[PDB]
Design a protein around this ligand. Structure first.
Ligand SMILES: O=c1ccn([C@H]2C[C@H](O)[C@@H](COP(=O)(O)O)O2)c(=O)[nH]1
Ligand SMILES: O=c1ccn([C@H]2C[C@H](O)[C@@H](COP(=O)(O)O)O2)c(=O)[nH]1
Ligand SMILES: O=c1ccn([C@H]2C[C@H](O)[C@@H](COP(=O)(O)O)O2)c(=O)[nH]1
Ligand SMILES: [Mg+2]
Ligand SMILES: [Mg+2]
Lengths: 117, 117, 117
């Protein structure tokens, strides 16, 4: 797919997602929420959406990823919503790996009001 | 698919999930976990499951979604498990958008005890 | 698929994921992150990855699952990264159900540097 920016990395065939980098240094105190920018935009292929999910290295540090749904039509820059849910302060270096992007299939249903049994 | 209730909204073709609304007003103090009700039930199509995932607007407020797996056979009402992982108190208005439902494909494997190399 | 270990349970046709058990007793104080071991390894089918996601029973207790992406090529033992984001202490008994594994499809794209409109 078409992407702009260098905040996203090519992956191998055997990996599920693309590593996303932090565009600038970020400090987070316990309980702080900050939207970390990546500087990348992309054109998800028709019929698919992107899921931002955490990496074990940052997660093991007590950092979590919130939200995480990239809609196919989105063209803005991708941002990773991170929170320090640990009890110690953390600094994420610039261009550090903070999350992963996984491309998944779309399923559109019509909503039918009825009675589910 | 068949649904009952008005706590879920039709989406566009370009969106990955359906917005879920809160059935009643909810207050959450830092560190509090509450199962927010939506009032909706649904009949997921055979071969698929539903994933409840967070929205960037509430997530940016320090709210996270836990659990999140709707099994195809479930017919009960859908509930969103939310926690205030931020350091400030939050109130979710009635019928406010709190999460998103995404329909994904099922893959059933048989478990073979063996030796993975 | 081929698995080794008894920390993972067969599921029904109607369930989305396989329950994962804790290999040993674990205590977690508010705000503590610990990688809970399961003792299971597996050979994900080619073309798929595994997603570790939370269960409503533990999630309703204020426990969250971080990270969660099993790459198809991984052969090591599966570990569940858990954090107590609640305000009370928790003990997870040995062989207790702590998470769920869901198998999802892989989508590999080539990264094309361009200009997204
Ligand atoms: O963690 C996230 C979640 C969302 N978006 C973007 C891309 C989506 O298309 C858009 C959607 O908004 P919500 O539906 O999450 O509010 O926001 C991000 O950059 N990061
Ligand atoms: O956040 C959640 C998670 C689960 N369920 C429901 C629908 C599922 O079929 C059922 C499954 O239970 P667990 O397997 O998550 O314990 O609970 C919810 O309403 N909300
Ligand atoms: O919650 C998790 C996340 C990852 N892994 C394993 C399997 C993956 O193939 C590997 C990948 O590492 P990261 O890409 O998450 O850093 O770690 C786990 O056991 N548990
Ligand atoms: Mg999550
Ligand atoms: Mg979380």
């Amino acid at each position: 797919m078409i992407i702009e920016g260098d905040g996203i990395l090519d992956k191998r065939s055997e990996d599920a997602g693309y590593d996303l980098l932090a565009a600038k240094e970020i400090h987070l105190l316990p309980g702080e929420v900050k939207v970390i920018p990546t500087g990348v935009k992309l054109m998800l292929p028709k019929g698919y959406w992107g899921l931002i999910i955490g990496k074990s290295s940052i997660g093991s540090k007590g950092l979590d990823v919130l939200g995480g749904v990239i809609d196919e039509g989105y063209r803005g820059e991708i941002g990773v919503i991170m929170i320090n849910v640990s009890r110690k302060s953390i600094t994420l270096m610039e261009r550090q790996k903070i999350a992963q992007l996984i491309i998944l299939p779309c399923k559109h249903e019509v909503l039918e009001q009825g009675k589910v049994v």
